[model samples]
Target: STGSATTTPIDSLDDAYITPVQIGTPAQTLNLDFDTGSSDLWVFSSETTASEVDGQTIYTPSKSTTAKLLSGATWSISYGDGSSSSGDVYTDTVSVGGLTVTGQAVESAKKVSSSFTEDSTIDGLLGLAFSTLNTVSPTQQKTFFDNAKASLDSPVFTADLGYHAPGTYNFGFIDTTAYTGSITYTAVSTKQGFWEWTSTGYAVGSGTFKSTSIDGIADTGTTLLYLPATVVSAYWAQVSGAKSSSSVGGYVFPCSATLPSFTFGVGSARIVIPGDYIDFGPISTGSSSCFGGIQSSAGIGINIFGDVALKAAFVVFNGATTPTLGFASK
Candidate 1:
């Protein structure tokens, strides 16, 4: 049988931004999802305080080794979950893979909640995905794509994920394994940004997959996993055997069958989901409880695997390079 993606963790980069960028000179570290479906790092900045921080990762000027905060132009960001983080923008010399770019923009979430502050990790966002968001004025900042357009080896760099190890995301060159270069490529027809997209889909376990196991475009800005409600339950239906005679908020399952086996198709490549991928965190609503993978207000949201999926495959995100993504277990 084909094996699921076996993954390792990524070492933390001391300096993410090569140049100076700030909410008020340059940037420090960037918080990113390392996704292929979407591009752009979205962090809850000084402008966003209502959005509580999730446990993904956050940046703090005091904690960084090489970050400088600009004393002007405060920033903020609000997520769909009604949580937000607002703060002054920080700037500094940042680096990624030792390739430095000048004037890297970054935000510092000043006003936030204890929950958010406690759960956040790392310093900032560094989205390494495909086709960034479009539809914006020149006054708006040009995410990583806009800044690094000149240095792209192929106008865009792809994402190569390993298993969803909870932390650390890795990447690779296109078709490097030479398993069978029959991977599909999606032609993009958008401008640039994180939320931008064109054509693509995913599929889940045993069926004609209209899309991959987890569908929809992804945003590195987000800190939690976003799964389809129905699919979430269906997936847990199989995890019954592993249910430790108890349950977590979302892991609630009927003690019965063997776990469900899930596979995703990115273009022509196939990605398999291991059993451990199903465990999602949970929180109380003051009334009912919910899992971290499916927070409130996800009614009309796109269905894509967040950290969960990124941890499973070697994803390729590059609207600047190739139009399609290559997903496989590395």
Candidate 2:
């Protein structure tokens, strides 16, 4: 079986991407963030506290006949942004695009952080990473992709993220027309339970391509591109007034600065991110300085090639016996 879904950015800065998902017997539709950085398919539901609901949509299990409680099961997850959610678990018929997975564990949120409640654009999150990262206690649950892979025409999925427009996520077979040229495949390490791979090298603007191996994860859930401080400093140095500001929380520069393009190599394939993509709007509503999309991953422990990089190319997450990642220009 194969399925396809359209993912759209929530805001102009492309803070996050969301796709509609169907859950339960009658298929209650909810717009969820398809996050590859984490593994815990959770949602805001009737179980959530009223104060935490805000304007978000809530999944009502009682309205679905196919919903069954996963006895004594519970889940809790915290994100890099310090926001968190936790709740009990249930199994139901969950569908993405058109692919259906029966008996899929659906973590219902009993509590949610202020960030999630404030941003009501997303009703929940659908994790695409390995189940090893699932936060469910006792018996860890499988992700929707993991459970549906066995029945798919091919044991793979693809991410074609857009800068500010809507993009597509494909399950089963890769859409040849979705990408240009050919795909460059690389071995993936699930040791960290992520689609982690080492990038060949990188070039700031049209400068020299550094012959260094940078280990990072292809995280669709993340918003920016994070690398070592040296690499990040090199890129920011080109800008006249660019600086790492403690007040701003990251590297920021004059909004009038003419930013240069960034290029990263995957095998021999070079994916280029346009200069405008890195200009992540203003620091504040009417601030003269803009936050850079590329930042230092110094304290994060690991680098991240997030939407800033993923949106520049087509990404394939191969879930065969031996996992692999494929990259191609689009």
Candidate 3:
């Protein structure tokens, strides 16, 4: 069985991508963020407090006949940005695109942080990473992809994330027409519960490609591209008025600065991110200072190739016995 779904950026900033998901009997449709950075298919539901919910849709488990409590199962997750959510667990019929999976763990949120509550565009998150990272205690649950892998035509999924446009998430098979040229494949390490791989090197604009190994994760949940301070500094140096601003909390430059494109290598393949992609909007409304899409991963411990990087290529997350990651230009 194969399935396909459309994912669209939540806002003009391309902050997060949202896709429609069907959960429970009678098919309750909710827009959820397909996050690859974390594992836990959690949702805002009737279990959530009334005051906590703004304009977001809520999943009512009691309304679905197929829904069954997972007994004592409970889950809680906190993101790097300090947003958090926790709730009880329920097993229900969950469907993505046209692929359906019965008895899929659907975490119902009872508590949520202010950031999540404020953002009404996202109802919840559907984790696509390995099940090893699942936060549910007692018995960790398999992600929707893992549960459907055996029956799928292939144990793989592809992410074609776009800048401000709509993209696609294809499961079970790779759409040959979705990418150009040949695909460059690399080994992946799931021990850390991420689609972690080492990039061969990178270059600033038309500059020479430096030979250096940069280990990072393909994180669809995150908003920006984060690398070593040295690499980040090199890219910012090309911008005329770029500087690290304590007030803005990152590298910022004049709105009129001529930004340089960034290129990163995958094996022998080179993917280039346009200069406009790196010029993240202004720091505030009508502000002349603009924040950069690329930042230092100094204190974060590990580098992250988030949406800023993913948007430049078609990514394949192969979930076979031996997992691998594939990148192709579009």
After superposition, the stretches of candidate 2 with alpha carbons farther than 4 Å from their true spots are: none
- Candidate 3 has what TM-score? 0.99
Q: For candidate 2, give the lDDT of residue 45.
A: 99
1 or 2: which has the higher TM-score?
Answer: 2
Task: Report the lDDT tens digits of candidate 2 across residue range 42-147.
Answer: 9999999999998888899999999999999999999987899999999999998899999999999999999999998999999999999999998999999999
Alpha carbon lDDT of each predicted model:
0.42, 0.95, 0.94
What would the per-residue lDDT of candidate 1 be over residues 1-330, giving only the tens digit for each residue? 010121223322111111112321133344333333332344554344444545544445565555564555454544443644455554444444434545555545556645445544433344444323311122233455446556655544444433333222222235456233344454443444333332233344565556533435544334334556565544545443332222453344332333344555555566666544543322333422323232221464565445455445655555444344444565
RMSD of each predicted structure: 8.2, 0.6, 0.7
All candidates: TM-score: 0.61, 0.99, 0.99
- Looking at candidate 3, the ten consecutive residues that score lowest on lDDT are 273-282
lDDT of 1: 0.42
Question: What is the lDDT, from 0 to 100, of the residue 228 in candidate 2?
Answer: 96
